[PDB]
């Protein structure tokens, strides 16, 4: 996360993922809870040094207006295909 | 032994980047038309011994970390079907 | 098999199937060999009484000529579809 600070074009950094599948589908799920605690401790040291401004998405929405205008976004999921729900099982059609 | 590098920089060089994370908490509506529950994942991920000895379940663990760390902000998606 | 003999339209009777899979994928494969022996015993009884003429496909080809004429037979298999080798596995295409 800190190596993104050196890049000056990185204005807003966003991470989005399932909040509970990663702590339950790992090999040893309890260690993933220790991971979260140590991680949140580490990211709190990047906000007291003022490297990052830890905030919520609603706060970023008000603080940073959206200036550039996109005109079209093609239809897609975050897996690059819709064949996961229509096509990857023989009895989908 | 491994190359555990670290970083040095001047916090005043640039405007600090706005940082946020989105957690997507969701379970499908797992009740039958009668009302009985066929998919128990909204519940066993709140009261199982899955994150033992550090917590009960992912949904409850994320809630207790919000009390443990009162300075850590994050955006959450509590799915309406889960709520 | 003898019930087809009462019908007068049944001139040639043909049975076609895989030779070894019916007798090696059954629940109790050894008894399927008993079945074949008994069935061959029974079929010979229908041939000595001159009910049927148990023969080969050359003999039927030369003794019985084809009089009707078919013009089209649509493409198809004996499973009624070609999806078994193209479509029933997601990774076929």
Tokens describing residue C58: 């050359």
All residues of chain B having their beta carbon less than 8 Å from the beta carbon of residue A5 are 7, 9, 14, 16-17
Q: B48, C28, C92: which is closest to A23 by C-alpha?
A: B48
Distances (CA, A) of A28 to A22, A24, A35, A51, B58: 11, 8, 11, 32, 14
Cα A93 to chain center, whole Å? 33
Q: Does A85 touch chain B (CB under 8 A)?
A: no
Cβ-contact B16, A52 below 8 angstroms:
yes
Cα C7 to chain center, whole Å? 18
Q: Quote the minimal CA–CA distance from A83 to chain C in Å.
A: 10
All residues of chain A having their beta carbon less than 8 Å from the beta carbon of residue B7 are 2-3, 5-6
Question: How many angstroms separate the first and last alpha carbons of chain A?
Answer: 43
Nearest to A20 among B19, B22, B59 (CB): B59
Give the angle subtended at the CA of C85 by the CAs of C80 and C86, to the nearest 5°. 95
Cβ-contact B76, B23 below 8 angstroms:
yes
**Alpha carbons C35 and C14: distance in angstroms, whole number:** 19
Note whether B9 contacts A54, CB cutoff 8 Å.
no
Q: Does C84 touch chain A (CB under 8 A)?
A: no
**Alpha carbons B42 and A20: distance in angstroms, whole number:** 11
PDB experimental method: cryo-EM
């Amino acid at each position: 996360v800190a190596e993104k600070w050196f890049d000056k074009n990185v204005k807003v950094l966003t991470i989005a993922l399932d909040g509970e599948n990663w702590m339950s589908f790992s090999v040893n799920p309890p260690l993933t809870a220790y991971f979260l605690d140590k991680m949140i401790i580490y990211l709190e040291t990047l906000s007291d040094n003022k490297f990052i401004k830890l905030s919520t998405l609603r706060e970023i929405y008000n603080k940073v207006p959206a200036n550039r205008i996109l005109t079209n976004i093609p239809t897609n999921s975050w897996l690059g295909t819709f064949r996961k729900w229509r096509g990857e099982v023989p009895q989908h059609e | 032994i491994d190359n555990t590098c670290f970083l040095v920089g001047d916090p005043s060089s640039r405007e600090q980047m706005y940082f946020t994370i989105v957690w997507h908490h969701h379970q499908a509506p797992n009740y039958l038309p009668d009302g009985r529950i066929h998919g128990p994942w909204a519940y066993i991920y709140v009261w199982s011994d899955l994150l033992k000895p550090y917590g009960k379940g992912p949904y409850h663990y994320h809630s207790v970390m919000l009390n443990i760390h009162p300075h850590f902000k994050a955006t959450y998606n509590l799915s309406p079907s889960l709520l």
